[PDB]
Symmetry: C3
């Protein structure tokens, strides 16, 4: 009684002697990243800022590398003289005040000239200082772009370094079980069935020569996983397979064969013809990167909506009313009086 | 004479035929990171800045994917006329100068209005330009936060990719020594003692069926690592263990057994009963991240403590003294003279 | 006829019993990075900005952890009085206008004082706001430097974690084939030829004791990879080597030996004396990091060469001409007339 089924395998029938040359890398080229070269190159402007960025490459490289009428007349003269004197005094007052105010206006013009000058100078300072900040901000964004790429490359470089550490470990076992000894493995240490091997060095690792023989010809047999007698005792093959041959059972060694009748030295007497099926759980590395919470909503938690406006720098003409003197009219009256006094 | 001690193992006594189903992932899902989606999402504001950040995703994805008275009278008229004429001339001068200065003040008011207007406009330009810079700086900090997280995820993604490369290599050996051949290994290629196996593909790797039998029942024996005769010749077991049985020594095969008397084909004649104890050094990956030099102390090396102040834009009233004309007093004297001349 | 050549190996002649103690790390210490501590330390200033940087450590730690004359006289008085009256009126007009303009100038001085005051205050606001931005920019550059180092350390930490996952897998096989069973491997499970082993736990992994015997003495033989009869039938050795002995051929087992004559049970009859030489391709991980496109050329694609200038805040003196009143000359004429009227 065949156990279960799922029979069939290719069984060696004849062999060929041959070689298999192989190389395993066991050590990596050493690296140094000259961060500035990676980030920007030789544009002085980026250099100027990178030097303020902190000692960045210390960590990058440490990680990667270590890895009656007369009286009236005289009376009038008195009044006339006093009249003219009062005028004389008034003209005196006018000259003084008007000239004083004229000077005050001239002093104002000079002070204003300087105040405006100073404002102009200040505004240029602000514009230069502010524009410089804005321009640098454009540069900083490009630099951070480049540095985050640098980190992507550090990670790739380290990952490959780890893969080498693993590979090198494999090389050590291949030395221990292929050159320092003769193992009993199939399709390892070269191919086929191992005989002998050589190990020589190569620039970054080990170069192996494996001597072995390989199945070169083989046949097909409906090899059974096992057999139960028609009754209740099970039989497993030992280092071979149960092979049905014209309906009967013989078995073959798994490395080369003769359909030998199954004897009691070619099988294991089983505790039961029952088949115990088991199944390992599957672990699948379906990694994905989550999309972080909305940018705006996060930013708003601390973002400052700070605004301001310029002062209302505007003069109010309502309280500033400057006018003219229409004296000519009165002057004309004076002139007329002068002419009348040319007639009396 | 038992050698050393540290005896005891579980030895197979009976067997069961069964299966072990197994899956090995050999290839990863392909990924692309659409950096913008990761960093911020669809907030136009972040998009606006990210496009200025440089061609960031080129490197991110390339890495992850590729992986007488009358005379006196007339005399007086002369003087009176000249007196009035001099007044007339003076009033002329006054009208002209005062009006001229009045115009100068009006021109000043108009020029000042424009100068202040221009200052106001400039201040608004600065405030807009400056506030815009400050607001963007708040955004840049959030973006860099998000990009540094992106790099943490690239590294995790690459690390898992490396782990798959290692796993895939394991799959290849499990194919070469379990399906393409029958190996002689224990608790490998499935479980127990390998007989046969099948390999079929699955979406991301290989799915194996392993046929084998397993110890299902076993016993306990105080198996010795070795034995020395009571004298000086040592004996090591071959593919089995020395088992003491009612005080004498038999040995058992390690895969199943009969307590067979130790014969000269069940042991190795040793060069000495001496025991050579050795010990590998321990390599323990207790990695830690150093805490970098103090932030302030580093920053200060280049930090610029640059300050400035606004110009002292203040008018000095000391040199600007504007006053009034108290002419009324003299006018009153004139008026009195006029009245006196109404009496003479 | 020797096949090919490349003969020679060291063949076991005598053995020693001994131990090999070994430890394999199978699990890592757990880590948490307190990002702020790494980035800057306890400088409040960096703390102040890092809290605005976003929830950075959420991702860092989630990844790492989860892992007739009288009439003339009266006539003249009329004219004189009218003359003085006209003067009186004119002085009235002068007092009013000059005083009015004097007030307008004083109001201007007060409004200007306030306008300049406001400008000064505004300029201080801009300078503070602007300087604060410039200072923070210096800090942001240092922080990004430090964060990009943090990412270099995350990648190293993850890489080591992967290496442990690989190591742990090795430990499991070393348990399955060294302690739970007796394998047939050489220089594995300890050293030499495995007999027995023990496994005990240790703080981060497994501690093994392996019992085995090792070749302690061995000889040299010019072992051939194979032999062809002088005719056309090839012979490969089985689990041993063909050894030429005084010109004839014997073979030895590969684990210990007697130069046994080659019998028909010590070799494989080959299909051909031909030697099949093969060679695996070499895969060498010579990874390098490309130098990105020129910084300037990339930046210029979006860089804004935006400039501006301060308004030409300058008063034009050409239209502002302020002058003085030379009235004294006429006054002198008036004074002379007064004296003449003291004589008539």
């Amino acid at each position: 009684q065949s156990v279960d089924g799922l029979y069939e395998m290719q069984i060696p029938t004849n062999f060929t002697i041959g070689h298999h040359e192989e190389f395993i890398q066991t050590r990596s080229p050493k690296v140094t990243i000259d961060c500035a070269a990676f980030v920007c190159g030789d544009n002085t402007a980026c250099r100027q800022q990178l030097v303020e960025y902190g000692s960045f490459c210390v960590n990058v490289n440490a990680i990667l590398n270590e890895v009656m009428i007369a009286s009236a007349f005289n009376n009038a003269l008195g009044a006339i003289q006093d009249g003219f004197d009062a005028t004389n005094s008034a003209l005196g007052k006018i000259q003084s005040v008007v000239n004083a105010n004229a000077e005050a206006l001239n002093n104002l013009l000079n002070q204003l000239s300087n105040r405006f000058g100073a404002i102009s100078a200040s505004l240029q300072e602000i514009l230069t200082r502010l524009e410089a900040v804005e321009a640098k901000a454009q540069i900083d964004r490009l630099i951070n772009g480049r540095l985050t790429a640098l980190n992507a490359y550090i990670s790739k470089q380290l990952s490959d370094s780890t893969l080498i550490k693993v590979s090198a470990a494999q090389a050590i076992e291949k030395v221990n079980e292929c050159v320092k000894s003769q193992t009993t493995r199939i399709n390892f240490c070269g191919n086929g069935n191992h005989i002998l091997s050589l190990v020589q060095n190569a620039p970054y690792g080990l170069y192996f020569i494996h001597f072995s023989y390989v199945p070169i010809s083989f046949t097909t047999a409906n090899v059974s996983p096992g057999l139960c007698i028609s009754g209740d005792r099970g039989l497993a093959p030992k280092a071979g397979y149960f092979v049905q041959d014209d309906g009967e059972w013989k078995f073959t060694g798994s490395s080369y064969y003769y359909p030998e009748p199954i004897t009691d030295k070619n099988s294991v007497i089983m505790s039961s013809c029952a088949v115990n099926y088991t199944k390992a759980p599957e672990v699948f590395l379906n990694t994905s990167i989550p999309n972080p919470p909305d940018f705006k909503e996060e930013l708003d938690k601390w973002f400052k909506n700070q605004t301001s406006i310029a002062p209302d720098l505007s003069l109010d003409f309502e309280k500033l009313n400057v006018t003219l003197l229409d004296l000519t009219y009165e002057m004309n009256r004076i002139q007329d009086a002068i002419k009348k006094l040319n007639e009396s």
